[PDB]
Amino acid sequence: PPTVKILQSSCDGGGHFPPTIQLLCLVSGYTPGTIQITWLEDGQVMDVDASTQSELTLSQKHWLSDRTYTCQVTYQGHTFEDSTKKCADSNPRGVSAYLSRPSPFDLFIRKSPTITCLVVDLAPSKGTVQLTWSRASGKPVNHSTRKEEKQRNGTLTVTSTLPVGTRDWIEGETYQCRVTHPHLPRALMRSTTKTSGPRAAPEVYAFATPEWPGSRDKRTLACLIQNFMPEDISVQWLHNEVQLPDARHSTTQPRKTKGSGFFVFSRLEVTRAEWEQKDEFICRAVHEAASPSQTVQRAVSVN
Amino acid sequence: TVKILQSSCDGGGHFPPTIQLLCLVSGYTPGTIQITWLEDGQVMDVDLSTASTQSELTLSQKHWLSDRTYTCQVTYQGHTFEDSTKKCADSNPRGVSAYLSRPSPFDLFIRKSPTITCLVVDLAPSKGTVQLTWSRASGKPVNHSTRKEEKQRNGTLTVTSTLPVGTRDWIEGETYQCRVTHPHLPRALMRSTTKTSGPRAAPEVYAFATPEWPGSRDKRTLACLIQNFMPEDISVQWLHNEVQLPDARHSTTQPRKTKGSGFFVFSRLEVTRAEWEQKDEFICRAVHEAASPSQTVQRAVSVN
Amino acid sequence: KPKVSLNPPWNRIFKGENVTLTCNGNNFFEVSSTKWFHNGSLSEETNSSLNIVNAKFEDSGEYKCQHQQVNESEPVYLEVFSDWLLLQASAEVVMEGQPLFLRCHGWRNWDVYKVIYYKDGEALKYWYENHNISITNATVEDSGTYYCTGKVWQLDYESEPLNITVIKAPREKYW
Ligand SMILES: *[C@@H]1O[C@H](CO)[C@@H](O[C@@H]2O[C@H](CO)[C@@H](O[C@@H]3O[C@H](CO[C@H]4O[C@H](CO)[C@@H](O)[C@H](O)[C@@H]4O)[C@@H](O)[C@H](O[C@H]4O[C@H](CO)[C@@H](O)[C@H](O)[C@@H]4O)[C@@H]3O)[C@H](O)[C@H]2NC(C)=O)[C@H](O)[C@H]1NC(C)=O
Ligand SMILES: *[C@@H]1O[C@H](CO)[C@@H](O[C@@H]2O[C@H](CO)[C@@H](O[C@@H]3O[C@H](CO[C@H]4O[C@H](CO)[C@@H](O)[C@H](O)[C@@H]4O)[C@@H](O)[C@H](O[C@H]4O[C@H](CO)[C@@H](O)[C@H](O)[C@@H]4O)[C@@H]3O)[C@H](O)[C@H]2NC(C)=O)[C@H](O)[C@H]1NC(C)=O
Ligand SMILES: *[C@@H]1O[C@H](CO)[C@@H](O[C@@H]2O[C@H](CO)[C@@H](O[C@@H]3O[C@H](CO)[C@@H](O)[C@H](O[C@H]4O[C@H](CO)[C@@H](O)[C@H](O)[C@@H]4O)[C@@H]3O)[C@H](O)[C@H]2NC(C)=O)[C@H](O)[C@H]1NC(C)=O
Ligand SMILES: *[C@@H]1O[C@H](CO[C@@H]2O[C@@H](C)[C@@H](O)[C@@H](O)[C@@H]2O)[C@@H](O[C@@H]2O[C@H](CO)[C@@H](O)[C@H](O)[C@H]2NC(C)=O)[C@H](O)[C@H]1NC(C)=O
Ligand SMILES: *[C@@H]1O[C@H](CO)[C@@H](O[C@@H]2O[C@H](CO)[C@@H](O)[C@H](O)[C@H]2NC(C)=O)[C@H](O)[C@H]1NC(C)=O
Ligand SMILES: *[C@@H]1O[C@H](CO)[C@@H](O)[C@H](O)[C@H]1NC(C)=O
Ligand SMILES: *[C@@H]1O[C@H](CO)[C@@H](O)[C@H](O)[C@H]1NC(C)=O
């Protein structure tokens, strides 16, 4: 448990930010057995940069965008963290509410839909937002799980997950999330329903880009899913019929194609170890119109 | 070399108590090195060294709240160096916002006419003009600006200023400064832009055609993945028989970080059967600063 | 006919605010002669000043006063709101003379920034902070729907439309 501090390049002249800002994370007073510093950008992942100093170079736009940077040191016992941000005099952001539709994977494959109500930009002091779940038809709802989390910038996050009957959601039942706060004049109303309209089966194309001579280690597998309506789609990757972790692949958010529908891109990086095994790599897309079993898949391999 | 560091604002942006100021003086021949601290032109601290400062400025939440200027000075062997510090001014005074864009690689290397745009928004109408100035940190002649005013419906004003710059100047790492001195704004709006620093990696481009769907035998989709490039800026273009297609014909995703060091972008284009059945070659081109020497890397797409 | 005045003005108020209704009248028979009427009812106030504190939703409605006998007083409509932003006007049947006052009041005394007033689609005035409208001797064209949009707690909010009529000259004539 050493002393960890962060120093920021102050303004010059009449309070002008330098064009390049150098944050200096100092970790002092420790027994050196293992040293590891991460530079999270609002919880994300950043590349690489007694007493140790870590340097972070930032542009004007990134610093002025009001983003919190977390310098986290891992010291076996724990994973201590600091925080740094552009500091505003007053006027914190007000309470925000969001409602998320169930994923197609949990709607058609696992048959256990769960809707999530998210309350963000709360206040640590006098924050007791009450979340109420209601239905348009007035039928009783299932028990919901509510959790509270402390973020890096000091604000609170309230997550309420409620399971939804598959038959009720398929028919078109509308669910409503009510957020009530003593200071708030009105109650935050959020509504989630189905995506009515035209339906088209997704078209899935999996492929392997060719090997760059520079790196004989890793291959980039990718999958384009186009011409599907509505925009609710789940993308998965299967290796020898085993689902890979969600952190292995990255899927682009749905975007409306020019002609009639939506298109998404999924990209995954594989090591030569799985490439030598000659296994069949399957890109799978779960969509409401991906008949017959709400699923369309493609397979790629060597050659 | 003399630099300065304050105490970082904690969490949501609240000033921690007992603000600490650090003056880093380094890169010198050892000798009679003397460092002084000044408060609004007065005397605050005098230091002597033969290493940065051995004494750091400890304040309270009474001084680091208003217009107070703290100066770190080095008077080493008759050579005087000065650095000034103050509570960092508001980035958006009175809510007026300033955005300083950067030239794309496309007009940085191919069009050879880079342009930087300073956009001042959320202003208010007044009897006068919005004085905007373009400067360079090193200090060099400027190439004018195409100033333009707007009268948005919500009652707010808008000032746009486009300045053409030399590609050689931007490549070397020059800093371009946009200054706004509207009378409503207390002091000024001070924006700076500079080419991103860090490692550089030549992009890898893989362009291909999707195989033919049995549903509709009219349109095909050409997809181009550009990965392993640093920094994050790039331009993606599609060429048919060596003439550039309109930007509306293709969709390019925003840059995203890969598992390792580098970014990746997907570009999707739609082609008709008449264009495709002519057996023409479709070029996917990525313009990036690290793709030496032409700064462009392109690949080809064709049937069978 | 006594006239009931509200201190402060802008009968459009938030829940929990303060008003004081008082009809002056030519006479000064305040002692046990002022009867205050809510919607078709009789209140329990005898003084000429009726103070509403912590104005609930039930305190809204039409108010009248009956200082001694006379005939009656002109009813005043008091409406309580609970929105983030409310447009408060000094009067809505304002003559061509006495000025017109407009204020964008947020919930509680919360600072409102980037306040924009509207004039039935066309924006009237935008200011960085909260600002009033003080139209002195409003003419005929100063009528229609008014509403203000602001930024409270760094979030955008919009008020409710308010219809303001200024009417024309009473008689003129003079042959
Ligand atoms: C302090 O730090 C916290 C986090 O550490 C910040 O909280 C974040 O706030 C932002 C904006 O309020 C949140 O962004 C929103 O996230 C929603 C969540 O959906 C995603 O996440 C769920 C899992 O939780 C996934 O299942 C889902 O598929 C999504 O991937 C989105 O739904 C929101 O999108 C909506 O709004 C955007 C505009 O913002 C629209 O463009 C979209 O179309 C859509 O309508 C949105 O992206 C973020 O999620 C919060 N973090 C966390 C961890 O929840 C605080 O804001 C920060 N404090 C300050 C003052 O900055
Ligand atoms: C009155 O109405 C006018 C117009 O109706 C509003 O003016 C608009 O204000 C918005 C908000 O500031 C402006 O949008 C901003 O654009 C900046 C510059 O964008 C560049 O890049 C895009 C491509 O992404 C180009 O298309 C564009 O031409 C510019 O070259 C952005 O930097 C702003 O923020 C973005 O970046 C940050 C990160 O720095 C992100 O966090 C943001 O989410 C966002 O992505 C912002 O998007 C818009 O340009 C203005 N219109 C104009 C000038 O015509 C007034 O705001 C409005 N007044 C009030 C009081 O509401
Ligand atoms: C004298 O007459 C007036 C009417 O001229 C009367 O005022 C009315 O009171 C009722 C309440 O009895 C108001 O009706 C609504 O009641 C619900 C609660 O049941 C409230 O929630 C309403 O307020 C808002 O609530 C939400 C915010 O929490 C809003 O989203 C919603 O849209 C509502 O606007 C509201 O109070 C009725 O609106 C008023 N009348 C007017 C014109 O406002 C008064 O009660 C009468 N006097 C007596 C003594 O009865
Ligand atoms: C906007 O106006 C309010 C109140 O306006 C008052 O009432 C009107 C009918 C008209 O007569 C105006 O000239 C009056 O000023 C202002 O709030 C007042 O602020 C002063 C100064 O602090 C205070 O003494 C008064 O008590 C306040 N009025 C009330 C009713 O509390 C306000 O300052 C004006 N400007 C804004 C909001 O930017
Ligand atoms: C004016 O409004 C304030 C709050 O908006 C209230 O003040 C209360 O006044 C009564 C006396 O009338 C006191 O007994 C309370 O202690 C006050 N509350 C406070 C100060 O929080 C009340 O609604 C109005 N005040 C007056 C004097 O009319
Ligand atoms: C209107 O403003 C005041 C208030 O009535 C009045 O004294 C003034 O003479 C009027 N001005 C005009 C131009 O009518
Ligand atoms: C305001 O007055 C106009 C003109 O008479 C009318 O069209 C409009 O409906 C009115 N608005 C309300 C809310 O009564």
Tell me whether residue C15 is exposed, middle or buried, using C-beta atoms within 10 angstroms of its C-beta: 0 to 12, 13 to 18, 19 or more.
middle
Q: Is the dihedral of CA A31, A32, A38, A43 positive or negative?
A: negative
Q: Which CATH class is domain A96-192?
A: mainly beta
Per-residue burial over B146-161, b if 16 or more Cβ lie within 10 Å, else e, is eeeeeeeeebbbebbb
Furthest CA-CA distance within chain B:
83
**Hey, what are B9's tokens?**
């604002």
Cα(A70)–Cα(A55) distance, integer angstroms: 13
Distance CA A281, CA A301 (A): 6
**Contact criterion met (CB below 8 Å) for A206 and A282:** yes
Q: Which residue's CA lies nearest to atom 25 of ligand 2? A: B101
Q: What secondary structure letter does DSSP report for A292?
A: T
Whether residue A140 contacts residue A207, with contact meaning beta carbons closer than 8 Å, is answered with: no
Adjacent-strand bridge partners of A108: none
Write the DSSP string, A102-168. PPHIIIIIS---EEEEEEES--SSS---EEEEEETT-------EEEEEE-TTS-EEEEEEEE--HHH
- Measured CA to CA, the distance from residue C21 to residue C19 in angstroms comes to 7
Element (H, E) at A13: none
Among partner residues A92, A94, A186, which is closest to C82 by beta-carbon distance? A186
Cβ(A120)–Cβ(A96) below 8 Å? yes
Q: Residues A98-108, buried b or exposed e (16+ Cβ, 10 A)? A: ebebbbbbbbb
Ligand nearest to the CA of A186: 3
- Specify the CATH number for A203-300; select among 3.40.50.300, 3.50.50.60, 2.60.40.10, 2.60.40.790: 2.60.40.10
Q: CA-to-CA distance for A180 and A188, rounded, in angstroms? A: 7
Which protein residue's CA is at the shortest distance from atom 45 of ligand 3? C58
Q: Tell me the two tokens of residue A31.
A: 């027994």
Question: What order do you get walking across the sheet with C113-119 strand by strand?
Answer: C122-127, C113-119, C148-152, C155-158
**What residues of chain B lie within 8 A of the CB of C123, using their CB?**
153-155
Question: Tokens 């191919």 — which residue?
Answer: B110
Closest-CA residue to B206 (of B249, B138, B266, B281)? B266
Residue A17 has which token pair? 């930010």
**Closest of B143, B141, B146 to residue B162, by C-alpha:** B146
Atom 8 (ligand 7) nearest CA: C163
- Residues of C within 8 A of A91 (CB-CB) are 111, 113, 153-154
State the Cα–Cα distance between residues C133 and C115, nearest whole angstrom: 11
Tokens (6 digits) for A270: 């594989």
Distance (Å, whole) CA A263 – CA A283: 15
The structural domains of chain C, ordered by start, are: 4-80 (2.60.40.10), 83-164 (2.60.40.10)
Taking alpha carbons only, the member of A194, A186, A134 closest to residue A160 is A134
Q: What CA–CA distance (Å, rounded) separates B69 from B44?
A: 12
Residue A163 preceded by cis peptide, ω within 30: no
Architecture, CATH, for domain A3-74: Sandwich (2.60)
Nearest CA to ligand 2 atom 23: B101
Report d(CA B160, CA B145) in Å as an integer.
Answer: 9
Please give the residue of chain B at the shortest CA–CA distance from C114.
Answer: B95
Chains touching C, CB cut-off 8 Å, 3+ pairs: A, B
For chain B, what are the domain ranges? 2-85, 93-194, 204-301
Residues ≥6 apart with Cβ < 8 Å to B214: none
Cβ-based neighbours of A113, under 8 Å, separated by 6 or more: A102, A103, A106, A107, A163, A164, A165, A166, A169
Cβ contact B105:B296 at 8 Å: no
C111-C115-C119-C122 Cα dihedral, nearest 10 degrees = -160
Ligand 2: does its nearest atom lie under 6 Å from the Cβ of B156? yes
In angstroms, the CA A101 to CA B233 distance is 33
CA dist B71 and B4 (Å) reads 10
Amino acid at the residue A193? T
Measured in Å, how far apart are chain A's first and last C-alpha atoms? 53
CA distance A96 to chain C (A): 9
Contacting residues for C80 by C-beta, under 8 A, at least 6 apart: C13, C14, C15, C17, C55, C56, C57, C59, C60
φ, ψ for residue B287, nearest 5 deg: -100, 125
Nearest to B287, CA basis, from B69, B47, B94, B108: B108
H/E segment holding residue A77 = none
Identify whether the C-beta of residue B208 lies closer than 8 Å to the C-beta of residue B223.
Answer: yes
Distances (CA, A) of C135 to A135, A263, B175, C141: 48, 55, 48, 12
Could you give the C-alpha distances from A8 to A5, A13, A17, A48, B6, in angstroms and in order?
10, 16, 11, 18, 6
Query: Would you give the distance in Å from CA B213 to the centre of its chain?
Result: 43
Alpha carbon distance B285, B48 (integer Å):
59
Helices (H), chain A: 60-64, 104, 166-171, 272-276
Q: How far apart are CA C123 and CA B153, in angstroms?
A: 7
Identify the CATH number of the domain defined by range B204-301: 2.60.40.10
Q: Ligand 2 center to residue B233 CA distance, Å?
A: 19
Distance CA C5, CA C78 (A): 12
Fold of the CATH domain B2-85: Immunoglobulin-like (2.60.40)
Burial zone of A4 (CB within 10 Å; 0-12 exposed, 13-18 middle, 19+ buried): buried
Residue A285: enclosing H or E segment and its boundaries? strand A281-287
**Do the domains at B93-194 and B204-301 have one common CATH topology?**
yes
And the tokens for C168? 């024309």
Neighbours of C91 (CB within 10 A): 16
Q: Does B95 touch chain C (CB under 8 A)?
A: yes
C71-C75-C76-C80 Cα dihedral, nearest 10 degrees = 130
> Three-state SS string across chain B, please?
CEEEEEECCECCCECCCCCEEEEEECCCCCCCEEEEEEECCCCCEEEEECCCCCCCEECCCCCCCCCCCEEEEEEECCEEEEEEEECCCCCCHHHCEEEECCCCHHHHHHCCCCEEEEEEEEECCCCCCCCEEEEECCCCCCCCCEEEEECCCCCCEEEEEEEECCHHHHHHCCEEEEEECCCCCCCCEEEEEECCCCCCECCEEEEEECCCCCCCCCCEEEEEEEECCECCCCEEEEEECCEECCHHHEEECCCEECCCCCEEEEEEEEECHHHHHCCCCEEEEEECCCCCCCCEEEEEECCC
Angle (CA) C93-C98-C99 rounded to 5° is: 90
Do the beta carbons of residue C115 and residue C152 sit within 8 Å? Answer: no
Strand C13-14 relative to strand C80-81: parallel, antiparallel, unpaired? parallel
Residues with CB under 6 A from ligand 3: A 186; C 38-39, 57-58, 60-61, 79, 82
Non-local CB neighbours of C173 within 8 Å, separated by 6+ positions = none
Query: Please, are residues C61 and C50 in contact by the beta-carbon 8 Å criterion?
Result: no
Please list the residues that pair with A23 across neighbouring strands: A56
CB-based contacts of B39, cutoff 8 Å, min separation 6: B68, B69, B70, B71
CB-nearest partner of C116 from B94, B96, B155: B155
CATH number of B93-194: 2.60.40.10
H or E element: which one contains A99? strand A96-100
Q: Which residues pair with C90 in a beta bridge?
A: none
